[PDB]
């Protein structure tokens, strides 16, 4: 069963420079280019953090390009 689906796992939330988010199991080394913003915590609490913080799925560069059209 996939570790990102393990309801009993221990999880972090990671974000990259494009302000995209990833669930992440605490047992795995954090990949380069990603920063821990929440956890270690339960899967449900990590997903709640993501659902309340990641409100725009566009990569940051695209959003900034669209804001500059003004």
């Amino acid at each position: 069963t996939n570790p990102f689906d393990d309801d009993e796992g221990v999880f972090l939330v990671l974000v990259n420079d494009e302000d995209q988010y990833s669930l992440w199991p605490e047992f795995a080394e954090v990949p380069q280019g990603w920063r821990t913003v929440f956890g270690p915590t339960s899967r449900a609490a990590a997903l709640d953090y993501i659902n309340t913080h990641w409100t725009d799925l566009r990569p940051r560069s695209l959003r900034e390009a669209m804001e500059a059209h003004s």
Binding site: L23, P31, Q32, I50
Partner: protein, 417 residues
């Protein structure tokens, strides 16, 4: 090592280049008539102008609810022309399902026709007043499109369905790879027979229209009738088409399938391809090459391909490989600790590269749980976890072995129990 330059990074650039180069060639055979590239693009430009005057702007999502027809093709092109992403609605699905998709994707406009009318922002293309307005608008010059803007949002089954948003950059890679690999010419005829809600239809519509080839549009429902498909293929000398494995079996059980002698390349994807079915194909249509393609909606239609039937292929045996990655795509076979497995060992397929979707519209938690940080790629990159169990063979081709979960296919349609 699949890195490859891209001539263009948007689908609008690819379609527009072809519209100039192939203007007076036939683009569409549909509805009993023939339309040239020039005519199709004039009509798509009028629709883009109408969408723009109704508030559609780059970055928006426009739902499309039209039966398979010339008007469907024009609508998809018009939406893209206006800088928007299209959300295909299969007019067979029940109304409540379509309404929920429009809500989740925040589609503010729905393009449809009177037959398929029985939602906010409805444009009815064959309403008298709307026909008159289209005739009275100048075709709109293509909007500027950023490659990371979406080209389409397609829903798949959700263990509530999830809407996969795929950027221009991702589908531009997928279609240019396809054209490099199989090399359509303007004399080719690809069949439009896949329902518009299945992402295979994205290349049926757009691959011929970025090359100067002709799209032969099957009637609504005709994909259900293999004798009709064989007749259509013979009538218009169709040279390229798609089947899902279960419907390929149905096609080969049809006595007149052998009349499709103009076929030179068939693409099979969506389910495991068995070796006895591939052998049956080669007995029935020896001049038609057959390739097995694989991929999830989350990674722009297909990420791997394998040549199965044709000159130069290996003898077929089970499992028939799903093959090797397409351009600008990486494959990892990982264990449950996220470590790469040695060659031949079974683990779960993870996908990297330019074709990954943006994510699931309106569903950040779900997105972050399946498009995860990438240990192997450049800093800040992601992987999509497929849920597919695979192994890599000695020679490097990948074999599909089954699922980590309970997901199933019906007639190629992804279904979550």
């Amino acid at each position: 090592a699949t890195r490859h330059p891209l001539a263009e990074h948007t689908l609008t650039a690819l379609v527009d280049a072809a519209a100039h180069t192939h203007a007076d060639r036939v683009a569409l055979i549909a509805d009993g008539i023939r339309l040239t590239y020039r005519e199709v693009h004039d009509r798509a430009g009028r629709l883009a102008a109408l969408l723009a005057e109704r508030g559609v702007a780059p970055g928006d999502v426009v739902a499309v609810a039209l039966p398979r027809s010339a008007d469907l093709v024009i609508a998809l092109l018009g939406v893209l022309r206006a800088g928007a992403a299209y959300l295909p609605l299969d007019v067979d699905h029940p109304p409540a399902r379509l309404a929920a998709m429009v809500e989740r994707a925040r589609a503010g406009t729905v393009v449809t026709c009177q037959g398929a009318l029985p939602l906010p922002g409805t444009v009815v293309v064959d309403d008298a007043a709307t026909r008159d307005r289209l005739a009275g608008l100048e075709p709109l010059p293509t909007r500027d499109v950023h490659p990371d803007q979406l080209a389409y949002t397609i829903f798949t089954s959700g263990s509530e369905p999830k809407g996969v948003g795929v950027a221009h950059r991702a589908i531009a890679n997928r279609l240019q790879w396809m054209q490099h690999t199989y090399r359509l010419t303007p004399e080719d005829r690809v069949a439009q027979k896949t329902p518009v809600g299945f992402d295979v239809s994205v290349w049926e519509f757009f691959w011929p229209l970025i090359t100067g080839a002709t799209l032969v549009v099957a009637r609504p429902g005709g994909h259900r009738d293999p004798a009709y498909l064989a007749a259509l293929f013979a009538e218009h000398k169709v040279t390229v088409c798609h089947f899902v494995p279960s419907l390929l079996r149905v096609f080969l059980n049809e006595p007149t399938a052998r009349r499709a002698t103009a076929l030179r390349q068939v693409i099979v994807s969506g389910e495991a391809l068995d070796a006895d079915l591939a052998r049956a194909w080669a007995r029935t249509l020896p001049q038609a090459r057959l390739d097995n393609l694989y991929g999830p909606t989350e990674a722009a239609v297909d990420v791997t391909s394998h040549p199965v039937c044709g000159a130069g292929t290996e003898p077929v045996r089970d499992p028939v490989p799903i093959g090797r990655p397409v351009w600008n795509t990486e494959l990892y076979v990982l264990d449950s600790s996220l470590r790469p497995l040695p060659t031949g060992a079974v683990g779960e397929l993870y996908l990297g590269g330019v074709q990954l979707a943006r994510g699931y519209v309106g569903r950040p938690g779900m997105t972050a749980s399946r498009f995860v940080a990438n240990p192997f790629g450049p800093p800040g990159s992601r992987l999509y976890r497929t849920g597919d169990l695979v192994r890599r063979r000695a020679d490097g081709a990948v074999e599909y072995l089954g699922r980590v979960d309970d997901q199933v296919k019906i007639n190629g349609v992804r279904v979550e129990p």
